[PDB]
Design a binder for these strands. Structure first.
Ligand SMILES: [Zn+2]
Length: 636
RNA sequence: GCGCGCGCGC
RNA sequence: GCGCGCGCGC
């Protein structure tokens, strides 16, 4: 409802900024920080005497936030009659930018647009803005675009260049506290964030706290450490089936062990799942396709096994075995070549040991007893509770549902996936009104007597959420403390942190390096075929790398990109790959650039070989590779 | 293609 | 820092 009366706490928060102070406004998500910024932005613009005129820039980090604040600000400042506009990576690259800023009063931007136009010098000073609003301002640190912008601000403020400087405003729900393990290190971190934004005030709700607390979702947090089964023989057996089908894949693909860059994979993990993905991706489905289709069968079978171990981990062995029983029922009912019928046979040789390990009652899952008990209590306390349960995987949703309906001690419960249903089970949220929230072994609250239960067997997950709570304490205590300082004392502290930080940036400027200047071969990382030479390579727009000549065009084949994107300098037409029918390693992309159809390469697709010595070096990033970096020439 | 943030591991 | 992964940007 950002399209229609302030609560008192919005007035309280708006006040310091309305007084001309650089403020970080820190308030919970969804409490109306946006409205608060509409109030501040109205006041600022209307304050100027007739004859004078403000200009406001609002920074947004993601396209959807950009889109929605552009509509909101546009919507709101009609009747006032100010000109409202936006610029993102799409409001490009043929809009005259210093002229858009000129002819508008409220400009909504992604930060990088501004960073580029300061860097290119098209916008010479931040002085054309009278107010700057940073959404999610806690991002103003390290090398983030917000911080680059403030580096430009502070360079003007400290090195004296009048030049009036805009007021600066930041919006967040959480400021602190970085890698801090002490309350004193929390305050240093928070003081550094203010300094980064030249803020002298942190605005929080102090006087209208009790009004705020009525509308804030703050559930009672509970942590419950559970033990898992001591012996899992079901896992041992599947694990051997996974070794069986991994070795069958090595037969068809030697050096499977290097077909993905993911290391130390383990069965029954998310990370194994991702290994499977990268491998299927590194083998798209002429003669190489027949090998990759065979590999697809193996890896899609390992995926099901992998899904099954996870189900067994958190729900019951039955649930895991039934999942596989279904799957293999599909395999014969829609196939069913050599590999497939061999694979399901290897399974069937094992089905019956798995069957009896499954029904073995000493093999029951003790974690489910804990979930069950938590459920009973809540409902013999309030029989009309609405629970949402969060689990790891699509398949676990089904596991837990069958479990619930199958449990005599949950009777009583009516599961769904709004409504004649008490428990919603799901994976991610997208479709507060929930008085019970269970995170069953779920991998907290980034969105009435409500409470959140956290159930896990992992001690480190408990630890992490207790550390997080302790950080939130330190944050809130630090803020309280610094809000008691006289603003002048605080501004003097901030001034010399800025002076100190500026020195570091200016001192620690990375020296321009000596290039090695000699010609090196670029070879394919995967097959090792010679791609090209370093003397054939040219640098486009400082940061991108291309190869000259007709000789190279034969070494790569290209392939259509499903969704082609247009950036600042080029349009990503295609993905490019090695020319051999039996490698197809990802080499980079193909762009339309200044009407040229040229290839763009990533160094991580190649091995750099020294010619005379055959010695090789791997590089992840081009900026680490110090060779003679030759500028691209528009007619060469 | 490149850049930035965050999480896990050493 | 290195590796891997997630997210977002031009
Ligand atoms: Zn190759």
């Amino acid at each position: 409802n950002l399209y229609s009366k302030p609560r008192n706490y919005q007035l309280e928060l708006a006040l310091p900024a309305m007084k001309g102070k650089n403020t970080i406004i820190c308030a919970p998500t969804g409490c109306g920080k946006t409205f608060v910024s509409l109030l501040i932005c109205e006041h600022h613009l209307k304050k100027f005497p007739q004859g004078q005129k403000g200009k406001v820039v609002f920074f947004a980090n993601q396209i959807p936030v950009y889109e929605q604040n552009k509509s909101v600000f546009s919507k709101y400042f009609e009747r006032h009659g100010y000109r409202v506009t936006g610029i993102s990576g799409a409001t490009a690259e043929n809009v005259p930018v210093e002229q858009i800023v000129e002819n508008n009063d409220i400009i909504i931007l992604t930060p990088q647009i501004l960073v580029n136009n300061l860097k290119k010098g098209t916008i010479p000073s931040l002085s054309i803005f009278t107010l700057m609003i940073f959404d999610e301002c806690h991002n103003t640190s390290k090398q983030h675009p917000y911080n680059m912008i403030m580096f430009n601000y502070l360079d003007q403020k400290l090195g004296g260049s009048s030049g009036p400087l805009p007021q600066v405003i930041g919006l967040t729900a959480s400021v602190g506290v970085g890698d801090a393990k002490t309350t004193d290190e929390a305050l240093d971190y928070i003081c550094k964030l203010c300094a980064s934004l030249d803020a002298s005030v942190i605005a929080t709700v102090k006087h209208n706290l009790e009004e705020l607390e009525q509308v804030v979702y703050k559930p009672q947090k509970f942590f419950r450490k559970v033990e898992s089964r001591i012996s899992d023989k079901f896992k041992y057996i599947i694990a051997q089936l996974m070794r069986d089908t991994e070795s069958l894949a090595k037969r068809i693909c030697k050096d499977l062990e290097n077909l993905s860059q993911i290391q130390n994979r383990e069965f029954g993990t998310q990370k194994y799942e991702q290994w499977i993905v990268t491998v299927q991706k590194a083998c798209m489905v002429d003669e190489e396709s027949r090998i990759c289709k065979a590999l697809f069968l193996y890896t899609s079978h390992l995926r099901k096994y992998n899904d099954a171990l996870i189900i067994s981990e958190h729900a019951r062995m039955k649930d895991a075995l039934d999942y596989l029983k279904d799957f293999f029922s599909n395999v014969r009912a829609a196939g069913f070549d050599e590999i497939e019928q061999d694979l399901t046979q290897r399974f069937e040789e094992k089905l019956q040991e798995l069957e009896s390990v499954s029904r073995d009652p000493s093999n029951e899952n003790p974690k489910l007893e804990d979930l069950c008990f938590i459920l009973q209590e809540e409902y013999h306390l309030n029989p009309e509770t609405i629970t949402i349960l969060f689990v790891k995987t699509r398949a676990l949703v089904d596991a837990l549902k069958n479990w619930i309906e199958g449990n005599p001690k949950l009777s009583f419960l009516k599961p769904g996936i709004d409504h004649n249903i008490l428990i919603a089970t799901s994976v991610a949220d997208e479709g507060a009104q929930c008085n019970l929230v269970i995170l069953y072994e779920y991998v907290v609250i980034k969105m009435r007597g409500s409470k959140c239960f956290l159930l896990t067997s992992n001690a480190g997950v408990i630890e992490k959420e207790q550390i997080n709570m302790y950080k939130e304490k330190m944050m809130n205590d630090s803020i309280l403390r610094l809000q008691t300082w006289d603003e002048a004392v605080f501004r003097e502290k901030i001034l010399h942190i800025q002076t100190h930080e500026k020195f570091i940036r200016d001192s620690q400027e990375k020296p321009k390096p000596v290039p090695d200047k000699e010609n090196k071969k670029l070879l394919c990382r995967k097959c090792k075929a010679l791609a090209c030479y370093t003397a054939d390579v040219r640098v486009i727009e400082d940061c991108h790398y291309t190869v000259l000549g007709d000789a190279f065009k034969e070494c790569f084949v290209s392939r259509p990109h499903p969704k082609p994107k247009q950036f600042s300098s080029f349009e990503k037409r295609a993905k490019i790959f090695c020319a051999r029918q039996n490698c197809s390693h990802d080499w980079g992309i193909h762009v339309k650039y200044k009407t040229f159809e040229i290839p763009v390469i990533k160094i991580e697709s190649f091995v750099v070989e020294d010619i005379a010595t055959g010695v090789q070096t791997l590089y992840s990033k081009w900026k680490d590779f110090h060779f003679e970096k030759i500028p691209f020439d528009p007619a060469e």
